[PDB]
Symmetry: C3
Subunit: 97 residues, 3 copies
């Protein structure tokens, strides 16, 4: 279970610990242990990015609903147009799965 | 081509397989194998982040447009200064 | 921004390791990775803090729309979407 970016700081600090332990008394098993740790840190980095991406997708949904609110109340299409173009573009260049 | 975060998931599983093999039977060839796959998974991560940072600035520009519209149509100055301050306190952090 | 340098540095070190695997090279690569992962975590951290400020801006925006008199239907829609973002938001 990924809980937040503190998972990333804790797994990074553990990796820094292994690193100094490696450079002090190098050894193959220490090298494998560093790689093991790197994989744990990377697995948590990936989990964070997936969350952030879903987050931004959900932000786009809120932004679309907001544009609808402004339209449902009679705001000028002159104004809505610029917002609709920017959101269209963002929806195109959005990082997704 | 970076297609999305599914790339990160796919390069990560690959690195995990390499790691299991390395751990059941270590070897110098697999250690370099793993380090190569780490640089790969990391390159894609840097690609996703790059894309997220550009996405984020696009989101902020849309927020500014929304707030500028709100002012145009006569929202109250209390909430208006409240939103403009949030944007300024974001502009600092960036 | 400075994420680039940390990745390029790491890809050049990978070359030197590719040609003549040494304990020196391997350890250099790992340290270079740690630095790259350090930059990557820091970038993610900044992004996560900024999205929590984006959430607050969205809340205030929804309040300005309710204040002006947006229909309950679209309003509830917006309130539900932000509640869902708040619940799934990446944080510390």
């Amino acid at each position: 279970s990924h809980m937040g970016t503190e998972d990333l700081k804790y797994s990074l600090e553990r990796l820094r610990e292994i690193l100094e332990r490696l450079e002090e008394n190098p050894s193959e098993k220490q090298i494998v242990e560093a790689i093991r740790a790197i994989v744990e840190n990377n697995a948590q980095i990936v989990e964070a990015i997936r969350a952030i991406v879903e987050n931004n997708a959900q932000i786009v949904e809120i932004l679309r609903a907001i544009i609808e609110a402004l339209e449902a109340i009679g705001v000028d299409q002159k104004i809505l147009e610029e917002m609709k173009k920017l959101l269209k573009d963002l929806k195109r260049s959005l990082e997704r799965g």
